[PDB]
Amino acid sequence: AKKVFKRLEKSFSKIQNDK
């Protein structure tokens, strides 16, 4: 149930590309 991290990782994932 505490895996919303995925959605959060999705928002931060964009930053990983523009590092």
Curated annotation (Swiss-Prot):
It comes from the Bacteria. Part of the 50S ribosomal subunit. Belongs to the universal ribosomal protein uL1 family. Binds directly to 23S rRNA. The L1 stalk is quite mobile in the ribosome, and is involved in E site tRNA release. This is Large ribosomal subunit protein uL1. The chain holds residues 2 to 20 of 234 of the full protein.
